[PDB]
Amino acid sequence: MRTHSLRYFRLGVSDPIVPEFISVGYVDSHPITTYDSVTRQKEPRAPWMAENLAPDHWERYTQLLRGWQQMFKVELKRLQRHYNHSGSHTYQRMIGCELLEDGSTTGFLQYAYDGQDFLIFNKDTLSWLAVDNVAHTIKQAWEANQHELLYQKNWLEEECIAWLKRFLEYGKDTLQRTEPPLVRVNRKETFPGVTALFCKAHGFYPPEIYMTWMKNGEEIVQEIDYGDILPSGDGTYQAWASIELLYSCHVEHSGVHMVLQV
């Protein structure tokens, strides 16, 4: 199995134009759950989530999300008071875990104020890393509750991973599939005497792809331009890499290596 991850995001907006609160869950790049302050309901985002979780899951987490929504509103008000900020500001949260290919795990829990790092949980020392003195004030208050830190460590290391394993089974046909890339090299004289080489890949799943340009099989070419890995809209992805010009494009995707000699 490849590396997989589970994560839950929260967005809180003060004085919005836009919901006051949104929560979205993901398995890798796939949305799995959604909640907002308008619907006040937690709903599946993936048919394999809807098909496999009974209504009591959605009923229970809707109640929790309504409480988390209220807690987010109060916490953003306290942050604004600490910073002496008026107007519309954002509060964000990300919690999740990763199950690596080798069986080892990672877990993370972070907060952001106005889209910047604010508090970073360290589950190995059971402490919060504060970026400034407002975050330090919150860190001191939160660390006073040792039970909650321990609870968060247990959730990140044990509960999150068990949810991830459960969801990966539910979404097996989507998440554990391989759609190999369609790769081509395009050559063109651009500015006189200048040749541009593009290595373009599309139709692949998962989105994680490695592409590079090599010279005489050995050295990586200096000054490679990389294209972002973009969703094609049909569940597959596209990307590219280019160079100015014996050159070859090297592509690695889900245990398969590919060379396109120019």
């Epitope: 229970r60 409480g67 209220q70 039970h147 909650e148 609870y151 247990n154 959730w155």
Partner: antibody, heavy 108, light 113 residues
Framework: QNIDQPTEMTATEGAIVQINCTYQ??????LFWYQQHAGEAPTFLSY??LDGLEEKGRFSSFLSRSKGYSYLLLKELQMKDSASYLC??????????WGAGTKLIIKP | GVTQTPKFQVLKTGQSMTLQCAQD?????MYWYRQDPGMGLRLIYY???????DKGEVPNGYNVSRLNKREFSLRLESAAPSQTSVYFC?????????????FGEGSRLTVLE
């Protein structure tokens, strides 16, 4: 989903009693121990979520997550320790599942 | 802590009853439990925060109102002899892990034909 603790336990004054709690839940988000005197409200004793033994005076709370087991250990037993001891486990959906309780009887 | 009333109540089958509960700990979550011999506390209704309530394990014959952040009342619409029990109101800072539950003194209710 089940939480199991003995119905009743009897020990002698000045001795030690270990009250076991086993749980079969889909997930685990912590284990509580409460003390409830006859005709009184339950009162908090401990919360365990990671592995180990936590000592609070004459009372200790142990947890083994892999074994799905906890115990409440009461040392130097006094008559005032005669009460029911309730364990509760928070499951994967944060539902608190309460055990039926253990009535502890102290023989003077 | 948690203040609940009344401590004792005798009701006739079919009568209405409201159990009051308040907490001064600025807690978000509130609960109503019933305690019956030989079984664990059973959740009737809970309120994860102000502005929301939901059914517990034994909601039938009851209803609740989260009046404000402090208050959570339990209503017996048409009391039945099976509703003879000890009722405990409870509160915690949040429903999530670790947060200590605080119980009220308990309400002993007896429903008679």
């Amino acid at each position: 989903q089940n939480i199991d603790q003995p119905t009743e336990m009897t020990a002698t004054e000045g001795a030690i009693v270990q009250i076991n709690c086993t749980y079969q839940t889909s997930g685990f988000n912590g284990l509580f121990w409460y003390q409830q005197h006859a005709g009184e409200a339950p009162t908090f004793l401990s919360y365990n979520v990671l592995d180990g033994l936590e000592e609070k005076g004459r009372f200790s709370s142990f947890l083994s997550r892999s074994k799905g087991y906890s115990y409440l250990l009461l040392k130097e037993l006094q008559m005032k320790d005669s009460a029911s001891y309730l364990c509760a486990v928070r499951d994967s959906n944060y539902q608190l599942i309460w055990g039926a309780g253990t009535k502890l009887i102290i023989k003077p | 802590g948690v203040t609940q009333t009344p401590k004792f109540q005798v009701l006739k089958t079919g009568q209405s009853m409201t159990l009051q509960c308040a907490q001064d700990m600025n807690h978000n979550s509130m609960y109503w439990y019933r305690q019956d011999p030989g079984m664990g506390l059973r959740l009737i209704y809970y309120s994860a925060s102000e502005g929301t309530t939901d059914k517990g394990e034994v909601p039938n014959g009851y209803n609740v109102s989260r009046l404000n952040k402090r208050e959570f009342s339990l209503r017996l619409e048409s009391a039945a002899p099976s509703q003879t029990s000890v009722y405990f109101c409870a509160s915690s800072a949040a429903v999530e892990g670790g947060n200590t539950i605080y119980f009220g003194e308990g309400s002993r209710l007896t429903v008679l034909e």
